[PDB]
Amino acid sequence: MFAIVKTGGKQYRVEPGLKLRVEKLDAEPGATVELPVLLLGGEKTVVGTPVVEGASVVAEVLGHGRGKKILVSKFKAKVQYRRKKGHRQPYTELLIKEIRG
Amino acid sequence: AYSGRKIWPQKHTGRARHGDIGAPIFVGGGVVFGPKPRDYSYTLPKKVRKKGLAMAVADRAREGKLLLVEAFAGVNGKTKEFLAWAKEAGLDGSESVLLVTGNELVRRAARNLPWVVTLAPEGLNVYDIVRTERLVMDLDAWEVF
Amino acid sequence: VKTYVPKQVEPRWVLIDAEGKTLGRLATKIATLLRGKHRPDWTPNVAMGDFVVVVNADKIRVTGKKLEQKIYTRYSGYPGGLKKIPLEKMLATHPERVLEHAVKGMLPKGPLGRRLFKRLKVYAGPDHPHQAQRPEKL
Amino acid sequence: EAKAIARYVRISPRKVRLVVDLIRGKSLEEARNILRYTNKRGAYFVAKVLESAAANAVNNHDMLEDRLYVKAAYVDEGPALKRVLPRARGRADIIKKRTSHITVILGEK
Amino acid sequence: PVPKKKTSKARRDARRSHHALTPPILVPCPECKAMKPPHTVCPECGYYAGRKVLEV
Amino acid sequence: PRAKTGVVRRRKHKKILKLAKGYWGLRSKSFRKARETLFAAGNYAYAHRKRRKRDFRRLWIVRINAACRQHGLNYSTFIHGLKKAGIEVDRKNLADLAVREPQVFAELVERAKAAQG
RNA sequence: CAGGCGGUAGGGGAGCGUUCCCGAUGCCGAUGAAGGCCGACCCGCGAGGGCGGCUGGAGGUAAGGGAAGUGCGAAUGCCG
RNA sequence: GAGUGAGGGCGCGAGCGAUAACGUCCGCGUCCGAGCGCGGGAACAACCGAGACCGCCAGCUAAGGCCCCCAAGUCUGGGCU
RNA sequence: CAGUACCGUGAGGGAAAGGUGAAAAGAACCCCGGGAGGGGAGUGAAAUAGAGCCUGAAACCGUGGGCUUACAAGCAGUCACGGCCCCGCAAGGGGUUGUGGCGUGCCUAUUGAAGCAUGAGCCGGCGACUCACGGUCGUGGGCGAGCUUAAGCCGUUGAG
């Protein structure tokens, strides 16, 4: 049964133990345990109880596992000789893992 | 080098408004004056000839230089004679050293100086000493009063 | 990556039209539903469709003020002369092609708008020549 | 195994181009027959070629007549020469001359 | 006449797919073993109805 | 003093080859043509790194009309329903619940128009 | 943390490669330097830089700062 | 230490020109130009809304939109056409 | 082997063209064979070392290989998904297009451009603000009411 949340304008839904991308945030590499806030839940079997929010008291659950990868980009325009080249955008990446709510 | 004197017309020509054998293309013709004999000759006086050698060696003394000023090595001519003055003086392969002695005896003596300088009159070879250390002088007089 | 992609859609079948259906006005509605739009499993690259029939395809509720008031503008002149025909004649000649005009008027485009079209029998039977699913919906 | 050749001519690979996408496929015999009597220059050259490979292929590499199929070939350009010809208002209609360099091969059935 | 442009090897071979290699036929001749083209004359099987090559 | 080109031009024209060499035929065989097509595979690759966003956006939305057209009602309308009352999101994409099990979002659609009585 | 952020000319800040200097009676190198085909790993925001294989067959130059015919799509340019 | 007197389009104003012109000569204001890189405009620098670096299968909203070729009621009354 | 080829009436105008290896030690022999050109084989560290012989790229040239094409509107690349053959146990990494949204290029010139207004046959290579001395305003700076020496005489492998 699924589940969803936003890591700053990025909404995702993970089964039991998936993960691949979501930019990143601090907190030392793979060994630490953390968790933010949820939306309503996930589907299958018998869910269907969202309402006003629910993001209070409770919350979702997910483990940690940093691998930190710099991801290339490739920038360029082009008009009347103004083709400002040479510019990539490293940016972050995370390969962690998740659990329950 | 007086060129062949122009060429083909212009308006028409062999397709190319241009026709002066100034040779703006031949690999060896009408380029630019990068070099020019005068390689710009600039220089100065003793205002710094002194001050400079001072701090250096003075710092090189904060590491230990030596100074003898005047002495005997042996037959002031043979290579390994002065060798008897290398292992009996202290110095040996590593730090690199320099020294000044105005006697022509030491001249035809020091010949090839592998590790050091060997001088005669009044130059200024701090160059190699910068990347080195050890030294000796010819009287406080020669350094110049 | 919530792909969504339908993965092997596989078309449906249907029937429509009566001697009182509004030509053109309703045509827009066939295409938007022919593309398989109403099928969730959807990615505007996977050409699906609802195999269509359109019986009673003549005299089909002749809209409002169209009689001797709407002209057909197509077929470019090769010398200086082209083609025409308006309501009262075309409407009653080659009836199939007759309503399909207001249709052919707009349409989508590209190989996709084609494959999709094919499924569109028309006339004024009813009864279509290859009986395969007729779930009519007015 | 079966090594032929074709080099040091004074004409174009495009004249032989046909003399390539026609022989490849059929066996040694099929082509030898065909091309021999398919004149128009090319023919009387690709001949001595099927023989040079033939002599050694069954001299050093050891093979046989009917077991050496026509694998395929190869067809490319080569050197030139400078010549000129008269014309127009004392002009200069000028060019060279395109020569040939191309390979041929057979094999063991 | 006299146009402004280079060339595309594209249509080059697309107009000479037709050029092709068309083979010259080969007909029968028993005896030794001939298989000589339209009405040819050679020693291979020679023939049997003329006066031109050897028949031993 | 004797400094003249040599090989440097090849460095600053070789990237040109590789980073392209997969386009047409000409736009991949002349340093300049590639040069220019990199500018296009540039203003377009960047225009399609700009595209993908404002393309997938719509593809989801109308599908959301396809969940409600068969489940009762339409898009815009059901939207407000929720937003005013309680929680607000579902993200125009996540509603991909559309393909993976339906009756789900059915419950919530009715939750939207609930705020009208 | 507020801030700023297209930007032709233009005038400011850095740096980037690239040939001759000294460090070279220093050091890598036939258990390959120079050249070159391949790369979809490592850094540069880029300028570029590395690194590895393979072809290739005698030289190259640290850190460093010292000079600068150089930074080349073209100009119906010049040459092949 | 530079660039710059070929600018104009628009609008009000205004002399001019036959309230004749994507014209002239201006004051001014502004946009381009330098913002052919948004968006509308069907397509299109100078008209309204909009000022630029990332990543985005993120949310509001301004111009401008809710039958088709592409998207958000063929909404709701009311009449007039 | 160039002031030679060549041109010029004369006057004169004026050219491309360096390079096997350490050693030619330079292919003997036999088979295709016109002499040519080939092949084994040999001298040989290497004949992708062989005589338009160093290493040898680019415009160009196809044999063979894989992805692809006959319902079709194209500055031509792009990105979306998806499909087909290669490596990665894997997660996915390729190639290339299928539909489709996207698609007015460029170097000048300019109130004004995408551009049937210039130029660009195409690739390689060569290609243009330095320097002299002088002047100006800044900069790291030494000394500082003081602050600098021109050409020479000696010395200088070389320095002074």
Q: A72: which 2 tokens?
A: 């290339």
**Which tokens hold the place of F19?**
């980073």
Number of CB atoms found within 10 A of residue C126's CB:
15
Q: Are strands D72-73 and D104-105 parallel, antiparallel or unpaired?
A: antiparallel
Second CATH level (architecture) for the domain D1-109: Alpha-Beta Complex (3.90)
Q: At what angle do helices C27-34 and C95-106 cross, to 10 degrees?
A: 70
> Tokens standing for B144?
């110049």
B121 preceded by cis ω (within 30°)? Answer: no
CA angle C67, C71, C74 (to 5 degrees): 150
Q: Judge whether F20 and F27 are in contact, CB under 8 Å.
A: yes
- How far is the C-alpha of F23 from the C-alpha of F12, rounded, in Å? 19
Nearest in space to F28 (alpha carbons), one of F16, F46, F40, F39? F16
The closest alpha carbon to A20, from C1, F91, F57, belongs to C1
- Domain edges within chain D: 1-109
Say what the resolution is, in angstroms.
3.8
Long-range contacts at A13-21 (CB < 8 A, ≥ 24 apart): A13/A42, A13/C2, A13/F94, A14/A98, A16/A98, A16/A99, A17/A97, A17/A98, A17/A99, A18/A97, A18/A98, A19/A65, A19/A94, A19/A95, A19/A96, A19/A97, A19/A98, A20/A95, A21/A93, A21/A94
CA/C1' separation D28–I26 (Å):
38
Q: Which amino acid is at A11?
A: Q
Task: Give yes or no for CB of B5 within 7 Å of strand G.
Answer: no
Choose the closest CB to D19 out of E21, E26, E35: E21
- Is E20 in Cβ contact with D37 (below 8 Å)? no
β-bridge pairing D72-73 and D76-78 = unpaired
Burial E12-24 (b: 16+ CB within 10 A, else e): eeeeeeeeeeeee
Contact F19, F39 (CB under 8 A): no
> What is the three-class DSSP state of E45?
coil
Choose among A97, A95, A89, A44: nearest CA to A68. Answer: A95
Contact F66 C37 (CB under 8 A): yes
Using a CB-CB cut-off of 8 Å, the residues of chain C touching F93 are 2
Question: In whole angstroms, what is the distance from residue A6 CA to residue E9 CA?
Answer: 55
Q: Can you read off the two tokens belonging to residue C14?
A: 């249907």
B57 with B99: CB under 8 angstroms?
A: no
Cα dihedral: D40, D44, D46, D48 (round 10):
180
Give the pairing type, strands A33-34 and A62-63: antiparallel
Tell me how close the Cα of F25 comes to any Cα of chain C, in angstroms.
26
Q: Tally the C-alpha atoms within 13 A of residue F53's C-alpha that lie toward its C-beta.
A: 6
Kind of pairing, strands D99-101 and D76-78? Answer: antiparallel
Interface of A with F in 39-68 (CB under 8 A): 39-40, 43-44, 47-48, 50-54
Q: Give the Cα separation of F108 and F110 in Å (integer).
A: 5
Q: How many angstroms separate the CA atoms of D57 and D36, rounded?
A: 21
- Contact indicator for F87, A40 with CB cutoff of 8 Å: yes
Q: Are B85 and B73 in contact (CB under 8 A)?
A: yes
Q: Is B130 near strand I, with its CB below 7 A from some atom of it?
A: no
